[PDB]
Amino acid sequence: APHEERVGDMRIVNITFSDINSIKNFQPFSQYFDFTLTGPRYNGNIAQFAMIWKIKNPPHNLLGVFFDNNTRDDEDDKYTLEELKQMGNGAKNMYIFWQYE
Amino acid sequence: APHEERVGDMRIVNITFSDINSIKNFQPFSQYFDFTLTGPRYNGNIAQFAMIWKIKNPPHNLLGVFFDNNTRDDEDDKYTLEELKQMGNGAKNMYIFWQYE
Amino acid sequence: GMVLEATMICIDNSEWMRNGDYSPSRLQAQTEAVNLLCGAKTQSNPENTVGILTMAGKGVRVLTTPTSDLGKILACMHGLDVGGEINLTAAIQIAQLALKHRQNKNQRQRIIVFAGSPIKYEKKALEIVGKRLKKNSVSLDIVNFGEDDEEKPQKLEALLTAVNNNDGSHIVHVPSGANALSDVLLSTPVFTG
Amino acid sequence: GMVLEATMICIDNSEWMRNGDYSPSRLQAQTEAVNLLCGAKTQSNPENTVGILTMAGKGVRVLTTPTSDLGKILACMHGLDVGGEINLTAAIQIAQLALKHRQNKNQRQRIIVFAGSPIKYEKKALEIVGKRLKKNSVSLDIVNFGEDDEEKPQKLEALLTAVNNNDGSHIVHVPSGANALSDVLLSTPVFTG
Numbered sequence: 001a002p003h004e005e006r007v008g009d010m011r012i013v014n015i016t017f018s019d020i021n022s023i024k025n026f027q028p029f030s031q032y033f034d035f036t037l038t039g040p041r042y043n044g045n046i047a048q049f050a051m052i053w054k055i056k057n058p059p060h061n062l063l064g065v066f067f068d069n070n071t072r073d074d075e076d077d078k079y080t081l082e083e084l085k086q087m088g089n090g091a092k093n094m095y096i097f098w099q100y101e
Numbered sequence: 102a103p104h105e106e107r108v109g110d111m112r113i114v115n116i117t118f119s120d121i122n123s124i125k126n127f128q129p130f131s132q133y134f135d136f137t138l139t140g141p142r143y144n145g146n147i148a149q150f151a152m153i154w155k156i157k158n159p160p161h162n163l164l165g166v167f168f169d170n171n172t173r174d175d176e177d178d179k180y181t182l183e184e185l186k187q188m189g190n191g192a193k194n195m196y197i198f199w200q201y202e
Numbered sequence: 203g204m205v206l207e208a209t210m211i212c213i214d215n216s217e218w219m220r221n222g223d224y225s226p227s228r229l230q231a232q233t234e235a236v237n238l239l240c241g242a243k244t245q246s247n248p249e250n251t252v253g254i255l256t257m258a259g260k261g262v263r264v265l266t267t268p269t270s271d272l273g274k275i276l277a278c279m280h281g282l283d284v285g286g287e288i289n290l291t292a293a294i295q296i297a298q299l300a301l302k303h304r305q306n307k308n309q310r311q312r313i314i315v316f317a318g319s320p321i322k323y324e325k326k327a328l329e330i331v332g333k334r335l336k337k338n339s340v341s342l343d344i345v346n347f348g349e350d351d352e353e354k355p356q357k358l359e360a361l362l363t364a365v366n367n368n369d370g371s372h373i374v375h376v377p378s379g380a381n382a383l384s385d386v387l388l389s390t391p392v393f394t395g
Numbered sequence: 396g397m398v399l400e401a402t403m404i405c406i407d408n409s410e411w412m413r414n415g416d417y418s419p420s421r422l423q424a425q426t427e428a429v430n431l432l433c434g435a436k437t438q439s440n441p442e443n444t445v446g447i448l449t450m451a452g453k454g455v456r457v458l459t460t461p462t463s464d465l466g467k468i469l470a471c472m473h474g475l476d477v478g479g480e481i482n483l484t485a486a487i488q489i490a491q492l493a494l495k496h497r498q499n500k501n502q503r504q505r506i507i508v509f510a511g512s513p514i515k516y517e518k519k520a521l522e523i524v525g526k527r528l529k530k531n532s533v534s535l536d537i538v539n540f541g542e543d544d545e546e547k548p549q550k551l552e553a554l555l556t557a558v559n560n561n562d563g564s565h566i567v568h569v570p571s572g573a574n575a576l577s578d579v580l581l582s583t584p585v586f587t588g
Contacts, residue, residue, distance in 0.1 A: 086475070119418070
């Protein structure tokens, strides 16, 4: 009955919003978003405003990716969403934000 | 580590193609798609070209959903992709076909 | 820190939730509100715990007993099943039992009910369950949304009068309009305290 | 049916597979080919078995031992890891071992290598391996795509000459052109025996 998506001990959490600005009120995640940027980003670490690295060839209902722990290679336009699923590097949750429609 | 997505005993298999037409050479799925129809569909049962029911508010890059056994309610524009994940009704595999963007 | 509480969120997954009068669907508008509430409650105090239950579908179902694992909680909200009609009294009985069994009894207890569908119960019937919750130190928040059940706000507010103790329980009425459901609730005590 | 065989597909997930000269990526062009091949082989004969192995990344990794469970097979191809360079000798040895211990010995044994990277081996060492494959009745199919060392076609061809047994092994050279990797392969003995 429960849906589950996993890569090893990392849980994959798909979250869908009609408007990305809704995430401004979503703690804790809001503190990692830079709401001025264009195109979906992932975080190399859990510093504030860390979601800045451009995901390669994203679905255009993808809004962004937040790994909740540990660090990973930080580069624009190299890692697709599928490869990022293999890049938790010890993070226990990979949050994938999707735009509804 | 391996990627796993599932609902109970039902494996969720995400497959991605740059071009919907590549699916026409993809055995056995080429026999279940109905390529004359616009917008992604799912099947209510197993039959030739049974993927005919319109998925509600689908992601722009969703191409279709194939359940590999059993039966389920068959209605246009009612079930989203997310809710379909609960409608295997005994299917062992839910194939979700995506377009690379 | 400050407030320390275990909350059970009771979400409406009835057939009425397919309606697009709340855009794009009542179900999606509830999902965003519930997601925001879990983040706000878990980040309010690291010892708060949040659980989630569905009220309709194929029966009342606990998705998680109360936990502080935000990822585990949010993971429950993907792939919701939809159908039937809510079982409000059963869902309340189940949530209260989950709250009773909390490991850290220092926590106050709170049920949040998302009432998006018509309420079939009687006003007297709802008052008794309210009085029971109050006796057991269980607070209640009610989110009334959806579309033509005229007695619904009256019934829900009678539930509230019966459970309320020291301003701990609240009701919010929110029709569809320019603001999403979550945005209306952000201003109310459902989110502020 | 009549052709009954066990196949190990060896896929290239080296750093070189990010190159966009095969649109949108060598990795995605390879993946679609592999998916089509798995479907074709499993539907050709319900007693065929297909396994999948990655050659590069953080060392050779068997994604699944040969099975006829198409869903289990296709599930391996979502969320691939990319990095490093291929270990072609280790891969071919691990493929051979998986095939040697197939449950149904009446199955023929075949390895398909997607060589999407430079070949860091000397002709004499490839001829040794193919000689060993031939001795143990294993056929080989080689897919040569991507760029940059000049001698890779000759080295891959030498490997093919040493393993080939009654025209059972084949090689395809496919450059970045109009027809995608999968389209080129469909009309070759990789798909048509």
